[PDB]
Design a protein around this ligand. Structure first.
Ligand SMILES: [Mg+2]
Ligand SMILES: [Mg+2]
Ligand SMILES: [Mg+2]
Ligand SMILES: [Mg+2]
Ligand SMILES: [Mg+2]
Ligand SMILES: [Mg+2]
Ligand SMILES: [Mg+2]
Ligand SMILES: [Mg+2]
Ligand SMILES: [Mg+2]
Ligand SMILES: [Mg+2]
Ligand SMILES: [Mg+2]
Ligand SMILES: [Mg+2]
Ligand SMILES: [Mg+2]
Ligand SMILES: [Mg+2]
Ligand SMILES: [Mg+2]
Ligand SMILES: [Mg+2]
Ligand SMILES: [Mg+2]
Ligand SMILES: [Mg+2]
Ligand SMILES: [Mg+2]
Ligand SMILES: [Mg+2]
Ligand SMILES: [Mg+2]
Ligand SMILES: [Mg+2]
Ligand SMILES: [Mg+2]
Ligand SMILES: [Mg+2]
Ligand SMILES: [Mg+2]
Ligand SMILES: [Mg+2]
Ligand SMILES: [Mg+2]
Ligand SMILES: [Mg+2]
Ligand SMILES: [Mg+2]
Ligand SMILES: [Mg+2]
Ligand SMILES: [Mg+2]
Ligand SMILES: [Mg+2]
Ligand SMILES: [Mg+2]
Ligand SMILES: [Mg+2]
Ligand SMILES: [Mg+2]
Ligand SMILES: [Mg+2]
Ligand SMILES: [Mg+2]
Ligand SMILES: [Mg+2]
Ligand SMILES: [Mg+2]
Ligand SMILES: [Mg+2]
Ligand SMILES: [Mg+2]
Ligand SMILES: [Mg+2]
Ligand SMILES: [Mg+2]
Ligand SMILES: [Mg+2]
Ligand SMILES: [Mg+2]
Ligand SMILES: [Mg+2]
Ligand SMILES: [Mg+2]
Ligand SMILES: [Mg+2]
Ligand SMILES: [Mg+2]
Ligand SMILES: [Mg+2]
Ligand SMILES: [Mg+2]
Ligand SMILES: [Mg+2]
Ligand SMILES: [Mg+2]
Ligand SMILES: [Mg+2]
Ligand SMILES: [Mg+2]
Ligand SMILES: [Mg+2]
Ligand SMILES: [Mg+2]
Ligand SMILES: [Mg+2]
Ligand SMILES: [Mg+2]
Ligand SMILES: [Mg+2]
Ligand SMILES: [Mg+2]
Ligand SMILES: [Mg+2]
Ligand SMILES: [Mg+2]
Ligand SMILES: [Mg+2]
Ligand SMILES: [Mg+2]
Ligand SMILES: [Mg+2]
Ligand SMILES: [Mg+2]
Ligand SMILES: [Mg+2]
Ligand SMILES: [Mg+2]
Ligand SMILES: [Mg+2]
Ligand SMILES: [Mg+2]
Ligand SMILES: [Mg+2]
Ligand SMILES: [Mg+2]
Ligand SMILES: [Mg+2]
Ligand SMILES: [Mg+2]
Ligand SMILES: [Mg+2]
Ligand SMILES: [Mg+2]
Ligand SMILES: [Mg+2]
Ligand SMILES: [Mg+2]
Ligand SMILES: [Mg+2]
Ligand SMILES: [Mg+2]
Ligand SMILES: [Mg+2]
Ligand SMILES: [Mg+2]
Ligand SMILES: [Mg+2]
Ligand SMILES: [Mg+2]
Ligand SMILES: [Mg+2]
Ligand SMILES: [Mg+2]
Ligand SMILES: [Mg+2]
Ligand SMILES: [Mg+2]
Ligand SMILES: [Mg+2]
Ligand SMILES: [Mg+2]
Ligand SMILES: [Mg+2]
Ligand SMILES: [Mg+2]
Ligand SMILES: [Mg+2]
Ligand SMILES: [Mg+2]
Ligand SMILES: [Mg+2]
Ligand SMILES: [Mg+2]
Ligand SMILES: [Mg+2]
Ligand SMILES: [Mg+2]
Ligand SMILES: [Mg+2]
Ligand SMILES: [Mg+2]
Ligand SMILES: [Mg+2]
Ligand SMILES: [Mg+2]
Ligand SMILES: [Mg+2]
Ligand SMILES: [Mg+2]
Ligand SMILES: [Mg+2]
Ligand SMILES: [Zn+2]
Lengths: 122, 50, 50, 52, 86
RNA sequence: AAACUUUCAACAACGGAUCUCUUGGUUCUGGCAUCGAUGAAGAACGCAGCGAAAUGCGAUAAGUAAUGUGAAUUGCAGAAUUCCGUGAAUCAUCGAAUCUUUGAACGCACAUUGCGCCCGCCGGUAUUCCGGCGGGCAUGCCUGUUCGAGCGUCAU
RNA sequence: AUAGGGUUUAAUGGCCGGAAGAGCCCGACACUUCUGUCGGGUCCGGUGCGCUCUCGACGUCCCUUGAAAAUCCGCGGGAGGGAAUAAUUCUCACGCCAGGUCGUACUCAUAACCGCAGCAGGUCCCCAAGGUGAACAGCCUCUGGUUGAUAGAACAAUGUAG
RNA sequence: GCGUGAGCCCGGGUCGAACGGCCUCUAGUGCAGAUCUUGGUGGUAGUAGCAAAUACUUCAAUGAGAACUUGAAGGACCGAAGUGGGGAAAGGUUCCAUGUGAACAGCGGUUGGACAUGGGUUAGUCGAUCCUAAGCCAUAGGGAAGUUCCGUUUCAAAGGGGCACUCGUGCCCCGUGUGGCGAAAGGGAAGCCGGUUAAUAUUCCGGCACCUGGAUGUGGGUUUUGCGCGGCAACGCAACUGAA
RNA sequence: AGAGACCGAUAGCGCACAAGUAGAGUGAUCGAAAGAUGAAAAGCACUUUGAAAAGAGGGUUAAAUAGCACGUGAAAUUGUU
RNA sequence: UGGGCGAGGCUCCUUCUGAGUUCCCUGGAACGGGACGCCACAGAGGGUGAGAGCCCCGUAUAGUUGGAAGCCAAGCCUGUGU
RNA sequence: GUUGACCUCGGAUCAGGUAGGAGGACCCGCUGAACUUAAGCAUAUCAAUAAGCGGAGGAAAAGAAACCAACAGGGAUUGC
């Protein structure tokens, strides 16, 4: 046959995506049955079919992740894999608001005696 | 011995698997310098470490 | 010089005691109320050699 | 052996009586499957694209 | 001693190790003579510089640490570029 | 007088010096600060139309998605695309995924692909037995919740 | 106690099934081969300080007395439960279902392991025929296995072995 | 040809891409030796030598070529504490078939444990898996600046059994004790005969059996004296309630 | 990332090459050798002697006094004249 | 002594950039020798059948196409004393 | 007596979190040699160094005087 283009795979629902995966897996096993004692243009179909299963698998997974992320919006705790992964060291630094807090007596001086803008003439 | 373990059994398969000469069409590539397999192991010459 | 023979016996490696064939140590009963005020009796089952 | 028997029934709708397995020197597993007497195996090899 | 006494050698002091793959696991002691298994630390000493370089970082696959420099250059961002399809 | 030993030249041998070359070393200067229980460094086994090694990747396995460029790949074969648009490539970039068995390694163990327990679903007459699939069960310490022990101790 | 009569632990003993339908030994016909078909027979005793393995009853030696655990059964005790039209927790006979995971090829040595090697060295066990003879002694033979170690011609000295 | 000399210059042959003179600057700057370092090659020399384990011979076939390939016929040896038939440790494809120039088999080689391409190891019953031995290592605790040392029931609040609920989440007894690893020769539930492949079988095929675990029905047994009868006895038989 | 009065395959890092690789040791560890045909494979068709390896003709090339034992090819040692 | 705007400027990536294959000799092949020209804020370096500024990639100069997120900041608009 | 608090000490696969390993050229501590020099050798020297062990960062450490001075007085720390 031919490739399964990734262009039209995006405009599908979950059920018919799982269906297409159903037939795709079938003849790949079936064509491997009769590959013995023969070799022709059919050998291009196994490399054709193997990659087609890869594309649809990612599409189903990607669609599931996107909808799952919508569910956990406006929630305090969300699963580990959906949390951002920057670095072990970067996940333990103080947040911007906490490291920017100041004492009450320090703010009092800074309000009335800040850094000035000045110039001195020759 | 006849009594083996799956770890030793698994290890002997790879050692036998990588012991046949190079395919013929390798030497016809452009800019090729490989001549022959230089890691040939024979049971009467070299003792593999288990 | 080296360590003399009677100094090595305290390390307890080769000069330990053989205790495979010994079943139990020889002791009396623990002191209890019955034996502090009256008496109790028991039967002798076996006379054994250890 | 339990998983092998399930696979054949779902994929080639053939029933078996017993399965024997071994691990080849190269590292792959080879399984012998014996079919029920009423079913014929010679034609299933032909009709299921197996080389005959 | 000599050839006569060399024929009595059909035993194994060491076996394969689960952490380093070398045949340096003492059977009776159950400790590796190269990587220090099962201790948490890995054996390493400063009186041999050649031994340290044989197993230093960068002599293997580097499955995860090899892609970090590329991620830092872009500032550890997340998302998709503007109007990508998906 | 030949043969044999010894010296030199011409041509032919043995061997790899010399001359010329270099996608490699060595030293100095300049810019930057980024590993890991969200499973690191290291180890093992696997994956190609025809591969043993090196390089690359993980049952989605010599790669998949997405963005950019705009016609290849090449030892052979095969087809693929042909720019209408539905896009060649071991290309460049890289913001979404996959990632087997192990390793600080974490149910208990391992010179064994060993032996258990808890929850849910599907089969076989099944809350208890057997099989398949999915999710869990390490230690030290902090904060909070909940159920408790003690004539340590207070009040009716 | 002797004697007479009984019960019981222990078959690698006798007979019957399994089982002659099998295996083995002869004879007579068939023929490119796919192929063979059909006849008979497969018994009866003796012997022993014989060899080998196993079981039983006695005896000798010790200032030496010669492992543990998982697992399985019987007994003492009397908790609970249960019928008169059926109930039944009957260790009796027959019948229904299931039994996952890894090893299994070959040598074990004057060529497959260790001695730098296809090295007169070293490396743990099972089975064990006939004759002479006290005998697993030495010498000859049967089953089974080899005929492999660079060869051809001559016969001085000096050697190594007899 | 020039110079006392280290050296400089030209002719002829071979070869194929860079290189000199003159004044200053700079250094990893000149070899016959060090039983010098690495690589290469000679005389000795077609010499020493290839001599333990009793031994070979005739014809035919294959082939470019046969003492050491194959068949047949003679002659010999090992002589059941074997040169026989099978295993443990260790080796790891050396096992079987077809084909083959060089290299290896210290002579030859059509032959090979060598080279090239394919093929081969089936288990509820045989082992591992289970239990412990000498011994090793966690836990409670105490030492040490520390990598870590001691400690194995010890100055520890250390465990498991039953039942019922529509539904898991509710009840009720007992309590001296409470981990793992460690044997292919110890302890241990159960398979025997016949046939079969170029190469495996107590496994594959045919026939006839057995053990453990889990479910359930018929036959027979017992009971209205509620949980069986017989023998003086040792005890007998197809069954014949039994928790802590 | 940019440079040098640095070394030029027995030098420069142990590694310019499938190098911490092949190999040795029970083990801790020890640890090499090895770059260059031509501008382009155009890597020798066909005939003839031989059991075969290969030889003699004849070809490709500016050159085979460049033939996958391949640029230049010194000395020790050897053969023929 | 509070709040809100904010031209304009600076960092990063990405589009494009001058001039002979003129004539003759040697050669297997001019990138060599001879004659005549052109470009240059570009005669650094490399490739192409032998020493190439003008055959090709690049090189020098300020600009130019397109895009993303943070900084800096001229100067304005508005509250007010418990 | 009943019932409700307080203090100390525990259970749980209770709700949410956190530590180990790698690297260690440079940096903060602990521990700690001998060869060698003295023409011998023991205090001394090599050296408050190599090896061993614990803990961090792009820098670490130090740091706003219980200081230096004796002057007509200087004024946190670090480096040349
Ligand atoms: Mg099996
Ligand atoms: Mg011994
Ligand atoms: Mg062993
Ligand atoms: Mg552990
Ligand atoms: Mg490695
Ligand atoms: Mg002379
Ligand atoms: Mg010459
Ligand atoms: Mg992982
Ligand atoms: Mg877990
Ligand atoms: Mg966890
Ligand atoms: Mg074991
Ligand atoms: Mg059910
Ligand atoms: Mg289950
Ligand atoms: Mg699970
Ligand atoms: Mg609490
Ligand atoms: Mg209380
Ligand atoms: Mg009597
Ligand atoms: Mg009979
Ligand atoms: Mg018969
Ligand atoms: Mg008959
Ligand atoms: Mg006799
Ligand atoms: Mg005996
Ligand atoms: Mg066998
Ligand atoms: Mg034997
Ligand atoms: Mg021998
Ligand atoms: Mg050997
Ligand atoms: Mg005899
Ligand atoms: Mg006699
Ligand atoms: Mg005899
Ligand atoms: Mg034999
Ligand atoms: Mg002779
Ligand atoms: Mg003589
Ligand atoms: Mg004599
Ligand atoms: Mg050249
Ligand atoms: Mg010098
Ligand atoms: Mg010299
Ligand atoms: Mg001299
Ligand atoms: Mg030499
Ligand atoms: Mg010599
Ligand atoms: Mg001679
Ligand atoms: Mg000899
Ligand atoms: Mg001799
Ligand atoms: Mg001779
Ligand atoms: Mg002889
Ligand atoms: Mg022939
Ligand atoms: Mg002939
Ligand atoms: Mg002979
Ligand atoms: Mg004899
Ligand atoms: Mg004889
Ligand atoms: Mg015997
Ligand atoms: Mg045999
Ligand atoms: Mg043959
Ligand atoms: Mg020979
Ligand atoms: Mg020969
Ligand atoms: Mg031959
Ligand atoms: Mg053979
Ligand atoms: Mg071979
Ligand atoms: Mg069965
Ligand atoms: Mg058994
Ligand atoms: Mg088991
Ligand atoms: Mg146990
Ligand atoms: Mg301990
Ligand atoms: Mg403690
Ligand atoms: Mg065990
Ligand atoms: Mg046993
Ligand atoms: Mg069977
Ligand atoms: Mg059968
Ligand atoms: Mg049963
Ligand atoms: Mg009845
Ligand atoms: Mg009873
Ligand atoms: Mg040179
Ligand atoms: Mg070098
Ligand atoms: Mg060289
Ligand atoms: Mg040189
Ligand atoms: Mg070197
Ligand atoms: Mg080794
Ligand atoms: Mg060369
Ligand atoms: Mg020729
Ligand atoms: Mg011919
Ligand atoms: Mg030339
Ligand atoms: Mg020519
Ligand atoms: Mg040449
Ligand atoms: Mg040569
Ligand atoms: Mg040459
Ligand atoms: Mg010469
Ligand atoms: Mg603006
Ligand atoms: Mg241009
Ligand atoms: Mg011309
Ligand atoms: Mg010109
Ligand atoms: Mg050039
Ligand atoms: Mg140029
Ligand atoms: Mg020009
Ligand atoms: Mg929790
Ligand atoms: Mg925790
Ligand atoms: Mg650490
Ligand atoms: Mg010194
Ligand atoms: Mg001194
Ligand atoms: Mg001195
Ligand atoms: Mg002295
Ligand atoms: Mg001092
Ligand atoms: Mg140090
Ligand atoms: Mg700084
Ligand atoms: Mg600081
Ligand atoms: Mg102050
Ligand atoms: Mg002052
Ligand atoms: Mg100061
Ligand atoms: Zn290790």
């Amino acid at each position: 046959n031919g490739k399964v283009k990734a262009g039209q795979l995006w405009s599908k629902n979950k059920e018919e995506l799982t269906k297409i995966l159903g037939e795709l897996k079938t003849e790949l096993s079936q064509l491997r049955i009769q590959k013995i004692s023969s070799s022709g243009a059919k050998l291009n179909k196994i490399h054709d079919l193997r990659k087609s299963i890869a594309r649809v698998l990612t599409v189903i997974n990607a669609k599931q992740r996107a909808q799952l992320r919508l569910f956990y919006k406006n929630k305090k705790y969300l699963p580990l894999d959906l949390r951002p992964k920057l670095t072990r060291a970067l996940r333990r630094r103080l947040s911007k608001e906490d490291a920017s807090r100041v004492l009450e007596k320090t703010k009092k001086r800074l309000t009335h005696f800040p850094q000035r803008k000045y110039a001195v003439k020759a | 011995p006849s009594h083996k373990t799956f770890r030793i059994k698994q290890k002997l398969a790879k050692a036998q698997k990588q012991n046949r000469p190079i395919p013929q069409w390798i030497r016809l590539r452009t800019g090729n310098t490989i001549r022959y397999n230089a890691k040939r192991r024979h049971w009467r010459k070299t003792r593999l470490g288990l | 010089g080296r360590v003399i023979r009677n100094q090595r016996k305290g390390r307890g490696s080769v000069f330990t005691a053989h205790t495979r064939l010994r079943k139990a140590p020889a002791k009396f009963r623990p002191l209890d109320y019955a034996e502090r005020h009256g008496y109790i009796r028991g039967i002798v089952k076996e006379i054994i050699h250890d | 052996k339990a998983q092998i028997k399930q696979a054949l029934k779902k994929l080639y709708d053939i029933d078996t009586v017993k399965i024997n397995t071994l691990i080849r020197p190269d590292g792959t597993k080879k399984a012998f499957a014996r079919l029920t007497p009423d079913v014929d195996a010679l034609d299933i090899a032909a009709t299921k694209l197996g080389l005959v | 001693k000599g050839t006569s006494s060399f024929g009595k050698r059909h035993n194994k002091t060491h076996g394969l190790c689960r952490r380093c793959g070398r045949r340096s696991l003492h059977n009776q002691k159950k400790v590796c003579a190269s990587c220090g298994y099962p201790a948490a630390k890995t054996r390493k000493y400063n009186w041999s510089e050649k031994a340290k370089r044989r197993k230093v970082t960068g002599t293997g696959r580097m499955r995860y640490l090899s892609t970090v420099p590329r991620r830092f250059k872009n500032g550890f961002r997340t998302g998709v570029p503007k109007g990508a399809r998906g």
